[PDB]
């Protein structure tokens, strides 16, 4: 058994972490007070769920989680929420005043004053770890904390923990739920500085989650709460292999082996089905074939793009519920005939399949209907680079005029970092196109 530490940075990371840790508790039968009746390993153990929870002599199961924001108000809602007893104050780290959507402010100015304290509270959890695999880092591209401080944390973790794997869940900015305008700057700056410190990064475009909530959950104008519960379902699907018995994606290392042949191109695309409104009266339950085929519909993807116009380097299918291998392989064979699924010539054309029999857990009072079977597909397709192209073009439009740059220079950052990061992205965009056409 090897432990995983989760780091939630900024507003988006913190509120997504709460969504995830709440779902984890329901999945493992852990109550809000940290008691887990079914665990008979009182005060310890090396069960799979211990990867994400530690135990106290009093039988309290505590997340291996650090929440960090440069501003108290979001994390205060953790300290007073339904799961207040779950975490202890040493895990919740807040500043006074935030990065104001300014990458330079979160990385250089404000980050410098808090980085040491955070690394200390992380090193207090890693001390309780018999063997640490690495970290799961949740954050937004857009925020000043999520972009700036995250990349500073990641640089240092590669120093303090050189052997130790690092995975991100990153919220890609969307205008529909953002009141910011400088997010393209922060996104490119954090990607350039984090890229060679991250082994695998799962991007979630808020635009895609937003439209999924509208189309399939019949929610007129989604809130962060609607978005985060859906995101946590997908994050849980990705991390379930780390928390339950199985043989696929059992350690953070296997994630990059199975999904990331090329280190730089480490942005797998997640597609999830089915999303069904809990308020939908009559629902015909969907088969293995139907949900699997839905993994190739762009409208079910975490990032709107067209995989038909790129090439796959890897593909995992992760099932929850009543699924058996015979039906999976029959569905794949049908889908292969009907759909354009073209791999790079040096990778085998195939799918790694993991089935967990427990059907997905849903938050009581949420927007998601319970389903008999669900699937999350992790595919490393070059088509996700469309998201880099959109973001880079927005960056180019503003930077040509140096709009908003004075804010970043005024916190100690040099205009040349803008052009360094942008060309790194230009190199990344060509890496994707070498491989994909």
């Amino acid at each position: 058994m090897r432990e995983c530490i989760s780091i939630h940075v900024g507003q988006a990371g913190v509120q997504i972490g709460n969504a995830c840790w709440e779902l984890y508790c329901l999945e493992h039968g852990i109550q809000p007070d940290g008691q887990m009746p079914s665990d008979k390993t009182i005060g310890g153990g090396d069960d799979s769920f211990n990867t994400f929870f530690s135990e106290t002599g009093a039988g309290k199961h505590v997340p291996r989680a650090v929440f960090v924001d440069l501003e108290p108000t979001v994390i205060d809602e953790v300290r007073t929420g339904t799961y207040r007893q779950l975490f202890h104050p040493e895990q919740l780290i807040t500043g006074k005043e935030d990065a104001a959507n300014n990458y330079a402010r979160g990385h250089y100015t404000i980050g410098k004053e808090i980085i040491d304290l955070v690394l200390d509270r992380i090193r207090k959890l890693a001390d309780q770890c018999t063997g640490l695999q690495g970290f799961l880092v949740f954050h937004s591209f857009g925020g000043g904390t999520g972009s700036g401080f995250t990349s500073l944390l990641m640089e240092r973790l590669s120093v303090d923990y050189g052997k130790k794997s690092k995975l991100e869940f990153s919220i890609y900015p969307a205008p529909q739920v953002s009141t910011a305008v400088v997010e393209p700057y922060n996104s490119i700056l954090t990607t350039h500085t984090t890229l060679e410190h991250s082994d695998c990064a799962f991007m979630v475009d808020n635009e895609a989650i937003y439209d999924i909530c509208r189309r399939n959950l019949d929610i007129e104008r989604p809130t962060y709460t609607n978005l985060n519960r859906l995101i946590s379902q997908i994050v849980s699907s990705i991390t379930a292999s780390l928390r339950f018995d199985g043989a696929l994606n059992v350690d953070l290392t296997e994630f990059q082996t199975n999904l990331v042949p090329y280190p730089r191109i480490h942005f797998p695309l997640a597609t999830y089905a089915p999303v069904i409104s809990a308020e939908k009266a009559y629902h015909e339950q969907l088969s293995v074939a139907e949900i699997t085929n839905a993994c190739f519909e762009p409208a079910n993807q975490m990032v709107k793009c067209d995989p038909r116009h790129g090439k796959y380097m890897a593909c995992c299918l992760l099932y929850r519920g009543d699924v058996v291998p015979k039906d999976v392989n029959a569905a794949i064979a049908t889908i292969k005939t009907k759909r354009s699924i073209q791999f790079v010539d040096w990778c085998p054309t195939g799918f790694k399949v993991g089935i967990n029999y427990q059907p997905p857990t849903v938050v009581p009072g949420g927007d998601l209907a319970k389903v008999q079977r669900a699937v999350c597909m992790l595919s490393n397709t070059t088509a996700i680079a469309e998201a880099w192209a959109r973001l880079d073009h927005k960056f180019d439009l503003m930077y040509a005029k140096r709009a908003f740059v004075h804010w970043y220079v005024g916190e100690g950052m040099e205009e040349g970092e803008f052009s360094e990061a942008r060309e790194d992205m230009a190199a990344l965009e060509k890496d994707y196109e070498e491989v994909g056409v």
Partner: protein, 427 residues
């Protein structure tokens, strides 16, 4: 995240008192400083603007400044006079004679350190101060000259704090003296350097609005200030009430100001209403959106179609469909996208607050960062030059120690600002 509020001079104190009168009502604070509201939503951010005192009484974090006592005596005997902390009335006796020099260099200089003592005392009682705001005019001498001296000295003592202003720009249609272009030009230079957001209230737009739309044949300054306080309440709504997302002044400024000197905004309000005259028909979201984007509803006398929007913020208040808001906001941009700069993507942002203002079921506040504001500064420059080429009325200033060079300098800087706006209008 507390804000410290300062109001300076005749105009600054009259509009400023209306602000505290309006929001004190919105937060259920009576003229005694005692809370008598119904909801808890109207006390969650009350720390932003009010200090809590003994007796569960709320005291505005407001400093009242003048160089003559007449207007501040009228404030204390005024509708909400008792609520202000009496130690925060800081005033001289000699007046400023509608003279920027007196307010900035001689009479104001004598008084400024006393004002800054109160500012410091109010600041040190702030858990996390997030900035300052000032109300003042640019046409007189105290608010214009001493107000900008205060701003310079506040930035010296608090160089990293946000500073925002409501600045009443002078106009000959509503005018007290002929030297207003002189005082405005000198003040604008200071604002260009030392403020993060300046909401430009042009006193003739308020006049045309009161006359042509509210059908008031002889509007008073009081009618003019009703429109201003409606906007002041509107633009601060999302700091004073829990809502969609909370941004501190810095984050708000970051996303509205792409260039440090171009921070002079065009405010607007819909529906436009007069005191007393009761509105019975609520507006539909399409009606609010058309009106708040219409030139007639702007309070800086500038045609938005003569320039391009760098950024726009809109604050809707009341119960309404945020979906309908999204669609109507997206309809305005997609229908007139040639008045928005194509090189700042998604530069129109929106917020909604469920709490409507007093007397309206529904309202919208418009904040426009348009290059059309250059027309306001061109007007001042023309009026400035018309007198300055003959050195007219300068003796009022040279007698306080000023040289012609400082005027030449002030004139040149504002002509730079105008040309800076023109660069981005053609990009």
């Amino acid at each position: 995240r507390e804000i410290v509020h300062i109001q300076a001079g005749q105009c600054g104190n009259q509009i400023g008192a209306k602000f505290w009168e309006v929001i004190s009502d919105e937060h259920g604070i009576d003229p005694t400083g005692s809370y008598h509201g119904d909801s808890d939503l109207q006390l969650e951010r009350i720390n932003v603007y009010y200090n809590e005192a003994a007796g569960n009484k709320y005291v505005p974090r407001a400093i009242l400044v003048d160089l003559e006592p007449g207007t501040m005596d009228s404030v204390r005997s005024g509708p909400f006079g008792q609520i202000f902390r009496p130690d925060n009335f800081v005033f001289g006796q000699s007046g400023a004679g509608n003279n920027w020099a007196k307010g900035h260099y001689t009479e104001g200089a004598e008084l400024v350190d006393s004002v800054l003592d109160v500012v410091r005392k109010e600041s040190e009682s702030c858990d996390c101060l997030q900035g300052f705001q000032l109300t003042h005019s640019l046409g007189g001498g105290t608010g214009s000259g001493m107000g900008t001296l205060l701003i310079s000295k506040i930035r010296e003592e608090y160089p990293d704090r946000i500073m925002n202003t409501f600045s009443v720009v002078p106009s000959p249609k509503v005018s007290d003296t002929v030297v207003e272009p002189y005082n405005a030009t000198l003040s604008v230079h200071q604002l260009v350097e030392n403020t993060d957001e300046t909401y430009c209230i042009d006193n003739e737009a308020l006049y045309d609005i009161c006359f042509r739309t509210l059908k008031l044949t002889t509007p008073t300054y009081g009618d003019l200030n009703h429109l201003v306080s409606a906007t002041m309440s509107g633009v601060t709504t999302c700091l004073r009430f829990p809502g969609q997302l909370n941004a501190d002044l810095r984050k708000l400024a970051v996303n509205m100001v792409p260039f440090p000197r171009l921070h002079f905004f065009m405010p607007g309000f819909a529906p436009l209403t007069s005191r007393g005259s009761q509105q019975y028909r609520a507006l539909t979201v399409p009606e609010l959106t058309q009106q708040m984007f219409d030139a007639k509803n702007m309070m800086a006398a500038c045609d938005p179609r003569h320039g391009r929007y760098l950024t726009v913020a809109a604050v809707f208040r009341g119960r309404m469909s945020m979906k309908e808001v999204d669609e109507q906001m997206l309809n305005v941009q997609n229908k007139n996208s040639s008045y928005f700069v194509e090189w700042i993507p998604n530069n129109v942002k929106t917020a909604v607050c469920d709490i409507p203002p007093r007397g309206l079921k529904m309202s919208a506040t418009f904040i426009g960062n348009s290059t059309a504001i250059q027309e306001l500064f061109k007007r001042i420059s023309e009026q400035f030059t018309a007198m300055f080429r003959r050195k007219a009325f300068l003796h009022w200033y040279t007698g306080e120690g000023m040289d012609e060079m400082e005027f030449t300098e002030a004139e040149s800087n504002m002509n730079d600002l105008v040309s800076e706006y023109q660069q981005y209008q053609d990009a």
